[PDB]
A paper describes a structure:
Members of the OSBP/ORP family vary in length: the short ORPs contain primarily a conserved OSBP-related domain (ORD) that can bind and transfer lipids such as sterols, PIPs or phosphatidylserine (PS), whereas the long ones often possess additional functional domains for ligand binding and/or membrane targeting. Here, our results suggest that ORP1 is a unique sensor of lysosomal PI-bisphosphates, and that PI(4,5)P2/PI(3,4)P2 allosterically regulates cholesterol transport by ORP1.
The binding mode of PI(4,5)P2 acyl chains is distinct from those observed in the PI4P-bound Osh structures. Nevertheless, the PI headgroup of PI(4,5)P2 nestles in a polar surface at the tunnel entrance, similar to that in the PI4P-bound Osh structures. The 4-phosphate group of PI(4,5)P2 interacts with the highly conserved His651 and His652 in the β2–β3 loop and Arg901 from helix α7, and the additional 5-phosphate group further interacts with His652 and the 4-phosphate group. The inositol ring and 1-phosphate group are engaged in contacts with several charged or polar side chains from the α4–β1 loop and α7 helix. Intriguingly, the inositol ring of PI(4,5)P2 is accommodated in ORP1-ORD with ~180° rotation compared with that of PI4P in Osh proteins; otherwise the 5-phosphate group would have caused a steric clash with helix α7. The rotatable property of the PI headgroup provides the possibility that ORP1-ORD can bind other PIPs such as PI(3,4)P2 that stimulates cholesterol transport as well. Indeed, substitution of residues involved in PI headgroup recognition severely affected membrane targeting of ORP1-ORD.
Residue numbers in the entry:
A (entry chain B), B (entry chain B): 531 to 542, 549 to 557, 565 to 746, 751 to 791, 823 to 950
C (entry chain A), D (entry chain A): 533 to 791, 818 to 950
């Protein structure tokens, strides 16, 4: 009996390692991204002011003031908001600031959140969608709210479009996490031909916003300066040029000052007084709001309750039921239907945009997505 | 309508990270651990020699020579052998070296491998079990073959027990992997009262084995020196004392020299000529060997074929079917039964030991474990 | 003898413990060097010079008196400047603060001097002049790297400036972004995209080049589509093609009439005029880190250079030499060594509180777009080098 | 101008690429420091001295003339020497090469001098003398750490030697292993196990102490069971108990008649005689890194010590000071600093090729078991310190 003196094949990539080897809720804040998007509304008084003004230059100031304000609550809000489930809605009615705002998570890959806002007196519509495109930039993560933001001043037959600056989270790997916001922002008034430029200057000039307003002719009509953590000012351009808390240039005009976060704040995730109301519920509101409102979302619920262990268990559950829901539509050939926004041309730029489908505030909700 | 000014719970371990965040076959050699255990037999001629000798001192030399030889093929065998499945058997009959050896993987937690060897002329039995207890020691892994090894010389009414030294794999994290073997080894001849001490010296004196033989009275009768990678020698103790490849002390006696690895070797995982036969099959052997022989194990099969991708897929499958098999017995209250070894007193030490159940070489296999 | 330690042990249940795990893990993490094994034997300062490969297009434009016909050559140069990128998944060495690279070609009619002008952020400034005194090509590149998913982006932040001296006119543009797909997991492939505007600041002529992204099914891979328009926004040319291969030009009105992945063939619109075609890579290419012949010249040295060039020149950079000589084992040790000499120099300059001095470039506004830029400080081609920094 | 690089690019498909990933990853990995956050404000040289807490047992044995009755006191000392381990899941600082620790207690009748005598392997040598000139307690400890599963083992390799000078007799033993269960995942708990043989080399008396392991359901946790036997292997005593609390002794024949987890109560076999009982930890304990009162004295300092003690003494160790003062944030920076000063000293001694000199200990055989050991070189209590190494 004769045996073999050699092996058949002589002795001799990441695939093997990949095949054979979520986010911690301790890094979230108790807010859906949709709710973090409604903080855009924190200073809706500027919109209402804008609508009551005759001169479009003065009107562009308040919209410029408002655009800065809608991204102003983010200082020290280093908690990531929960990525909204597909079909997650969120509504907010505020009787004092005079608006209603429905938002719906439209897609999940990529994550797109659609929102529609209306003044209660029918003076404005505010709408758009946001994809927060996350990019690891060095030792920091960038979030970039991709998407146009459209504000229609109904009493004035005009609409303003713009996009938001980039929101950067530094020291994400090491050090005290902190928020920067930089980018340039053009506000086009599509009736007048008026343009407003807002540079959110990057860091010294921390939080520094500088910019100007010009007519369609391209004549500057005022400069705009301040910090998105505090305030914006308008001033005559000629004296702003010569003259480069906050440095108050002579004869400037206060356009906006940040709303109030409570002394309780740094114990409550640095939420504003506006933010503290976002995720609240009560027996009345339970009957009316739909089953997709993120006020009925157990993990944000349980985290706001302190039950963090129950929050991370509940979070992984929804995400899993959401994959599973995707794979059944992946096979059953059904494809997802957006209850409250449909897709369509933005008429002021011709760029695809999500468009409110109507009928939300009628209630009588029917066949809603069962996403919890 | 009045809203809330604070959250219910103020804002505020590894569990979350653990719950919400195999071995690569590229690190194995194509051998079951059971097969790597049969390399103990590579020099069974020393056993047969031992059995033909009248003087037990001379007999203790050959058993000491054999004990060193059974762990000598491990130099440069830096490939881990596949952890044997529960129920994996392995048989080897060699007509020239004169033995049969059945081994069976007895348990999996911990991994215990049982083996029984018999000389074909009924001159010896060689048996024991091995648990290779792995410990990460610094920049190296230690494997320690826990368990007694019992060699019975049937023509001489005697039995020797001993345990194996520790097998250390250096530079496991960084550098060229390489094998060291260290430890002290006592060989007790239980009839004569004779003892043989083998120190496997740790590293300079790389692979250095030194030791002695003494009677029950505790009189040294010879020294024993050499290297487990090459050879062992006996020499008069009096001249070994005075006198401290290999340093040949005057008037020494060659007890053993390592068997032959082929020039092909370093292309074939550094297997010996003995090792190259272990995992071989053929149409004859297929009819006879049981369904648990690791010659019928697909991943060791496919890896020996070079099909490494198919090997790592096939490996994870068996391990998974093995967990699944465990969890069904975890519920169905069935518990695993060892086909060929039962547990019992080692009579020469009173220490629990696995004991051959008989009947293996009768074939007529019945109801064997379906482990592939 | 005391009954207590001066301060109780600090608690694990309180989350104050992992922010010191945070502090110590990152002091270790940022220490680590990127393995030479993902680099290619090129300093970014050298990768920057490949812009110049097709300088014959600047010379073409220098000698055309139709402004738009000059624009068609600058756009040709803009597209060609980024063409060598295809299949260049090696990451050129980040240049050490103080690194220079000079390249003189007489067959091509230019001489170029680059300096690594800052290390955080890593900014490369370059200045190239025509030898017939017919252009200045100058600017700066800050490669902003961004990871996500499987992809790495490098956005080259910076204004690039072609001044055609014989026409008293100057073009500015900003290059497209370069994506590298399937890092770690899969086969690497290179994509370039982003809108490039080229402006003739004299005439008001605007070139729009949209480097189209892959899109679904990989259909628009490498496609480049755009126009040239006059100061009043009327299209005079359509431009199209792939930036890996060719740029065509054609009547705008007819272009409107016609409106690891593999690229699509260029459909040659009737009446097109080829502006630029790539010179194919040598058969050395896929074995030679996918260099073009031009790229294989950059780190070449003779002792006739080593006397003339300054000591800072990256042709004298050891780790890039080690890697090119195949000694990749040494190259990560040379890399390790240089990245610590540079730390030590800069911390040393903090205990001393001295500001670092760029030898060949200074800061100043771009007079064409008001951006802050980097401007040649002169005297580089004098030789007479003095007090240069010791960086190797 | 060359047409190729001097050497083709080396391939990823060939597995020659990851062994340079291997080379570079480990040069980074072994650099990293263990976070101070798992340590406790004690040098191992100090953790070593806690053996001495119950020296009153040596003094008991020094003054007994029945040899076996002396054995019952050495075994009492052996068990007591390892008692403070319970709930000590902080890992004492690995002592720097050159570290010493001295401890003088007159209330306890001993004076001890330890030196860290090698860094790889980390070997601690110690020598303690009775002040009444009645014993020498000396030996060395190499803590061989071994990880697997959730558990870390520290096997203290070394021979420990009690010479009772008034009886011309000497005991040798080797301590048990100390397991730490549920590292990272779960609550840490400490277990000691291993067979300890104590030999009276004069009389031939053997003490066997089996520190029993936990076993299934945690039933034998901390139990210690053994006997004392004469030179002809006859049991004169059974010993039993838990090493956390007590050691009893009893007629051997009656003991045979009786043959995070919580421990079991000690069943007090009729006719037992208590040999040793632990002194309970203070209520400070669980807040004070679970020190016993003795352990809380070790790093204590007065300026009256800092003049007398040498500069190497670990009471003068900064990172251990930082940690004890609560400044744990600084302690990992002091740790970082010291572990690199020590590397730099030893590599420096390689460029110079000089061998390191232990000041207070030298190597030599143990005359009792032939093992190689560490032996006091004298002169430590003279003071008159000279040329000591600068290690802080
Ligand atoms: C095709 C088109 C591409 C689709 C692009 C999707 C990008 C992800 C969007 C998501 O916001 O960014 C993930 C990224 O995570 C983390 O590392 C981020 C790490 C750095 C985070 C920075 C923290 C500081 C931020 C604080 C202030 C910033 C405010 C704005 C933040 C809002 C962002 C949403 C968020 O975390 P996450 O909770 O949303 O987790 C998802 C989710 O869970 C989903 O569920 C998946 O998909 P699926 O598996 O359920 O289908 C998952 O996995 P995968 O499938 O994508 O592989 C998983 O990535
Ligand atoms: C209760 C009583 C305790 C039980 C003690 C078991 C120890 C594991 C024995 C095994 O040999 O060591 C594992 C350890 O792995 C690796 O990292 C080792 C890393 C360092 C390896 C060193 C490489 C150099 C060695 C070369 C020369 C040495 C020759 C001797 C080696 C033979 C050792 C078997 C081997 O690899 P492996 O292929 O056997 O993988 C198992 C297996 O797969 C099983 O299947 C499991 O259990 P299960 O999940 O299937 O039930 C798995 O996981 P787990 O359950 O234990 O958590 C998984 O550890
Ligand atoms: C004061 C406040 C400053 C605030 C910081 C913000 C901006 C800083 C910009 C740099 C951040 C980059 C991340 C870390 C990384 O290492 O950057 C590397 C990148 O590889 C990373 O490891 C990769 C990590 C794992 C996963 C990704 C793998 C990427 C594979 C590349 C594919 C090929 C792409 C090629 C395409 C074409 C490129 C134009 C650059 O290659 P690089 O080898 O040459 O390394 C330099 C330098 O050489 C020196 O080491 C530095 O600094 P320093 O060491 O002197 O201090 C370094 O890092 P850092 O210290 O800044 O973090 C380092 O950037
Ligand atoms: C020439 C050939 C040499 C061949 C080497 C073989 C033998 C070497 C022995 C050392 C190997 C240990 C592994 C690495 C580790 O770091 O050891 C640490 C251990 O923590 C590891 O990180 C842990 C890694 C992750 C997982 C395990 C976590 C363990 C938690 C501990 C729990 C508490 C247990 C306490 C119980 C009582 C103890 C008696 C000792 O604590 P340590 O802080 O004081 O660090 C020293 C020293 O201080 C200096 O740093 C050294 O050497 P070096 O830096 O001067 O060169 C160091 O490592 P290394 O270089 O040898 O690898 C280091 O051992």
């Amino acid at each position: 009996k004769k045996h073999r003196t050699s092996l058949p094949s002589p002795m001799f990539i990441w695939s093997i390692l990949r095949k054979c080897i979520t986010m911690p809720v301790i890094f979230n804040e108790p807010l859906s991204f949709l709710q973090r998007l409604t903080e855009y509304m924190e200073h809706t008084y500027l919109i209402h002011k804008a609508s009551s003004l005759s001169d479009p230059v003065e009107r562009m100031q308040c919209v410029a003031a408002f655009a800065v304000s809608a991204v102003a609550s983010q200082w020290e809000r280093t908690g990531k908001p929960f990525n909204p489930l597909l079909g997650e809605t969120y509504e907010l009615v505020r009787d004092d600031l005079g608006f209603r705002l429905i938002s719906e998570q439209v897609s999940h890959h990529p994550p797109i959140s659609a929102f529609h806002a209306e003044g209660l007196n029918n003076d404005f519509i505010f709408h758009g969608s946001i994809y927060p495109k996350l990019k690891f930039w060095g030792k920091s993560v960038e979030a970039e709210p991709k998407g146009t933001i459209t504000l229609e001043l109904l009493e004035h037959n005009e609409a303003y479009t713009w996009t938001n600056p980039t929101c950067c989270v530094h020291n994400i790997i090491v050090g005290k996490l902190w928020i920067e916001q930089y980018g340039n922002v053009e506000i086009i008034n599509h009736k007048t031909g008026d343009k407003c430029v807002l540079n959110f200057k990057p860091c010294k000039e921390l939080h520094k916003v500088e910019g100007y307003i010009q007519d369609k002719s391209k004549k500057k009509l005022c400069a705009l300066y301040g910090k998105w953590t505090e305030c914006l000012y308008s001033v005559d351009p000629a004296t702003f040029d010569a003259y480069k808390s906050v440095f108050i240039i002579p004869g400037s005009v206060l356009l906006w000052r940040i709303a109030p976060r409570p002394p309780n704040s740094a114990q409550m995730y640095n939420f504003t007084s506006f933010a503290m109301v976002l995720n609240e519920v009560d027996k009345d509101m339970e009957s009316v709001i739909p089953k997709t409102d993120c006020r009925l979302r157990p993990d944000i619920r349980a985290m706001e309750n302190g039950e963090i262990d129950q929050a991370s268990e509940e979070k992984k559950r929804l995400e899993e039921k959401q994959r599973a829901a995707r794979k059944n539509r992946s096979k059953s050939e059904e494809d997802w239907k957006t209850r409250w926004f449909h897709q369509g041309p933005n008429p002021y730029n011709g760029a695809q945009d999500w468009i409110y489908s109507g009928s939300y505030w009628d209630r009588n909700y029917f066949n809603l997505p069962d996403i919890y």
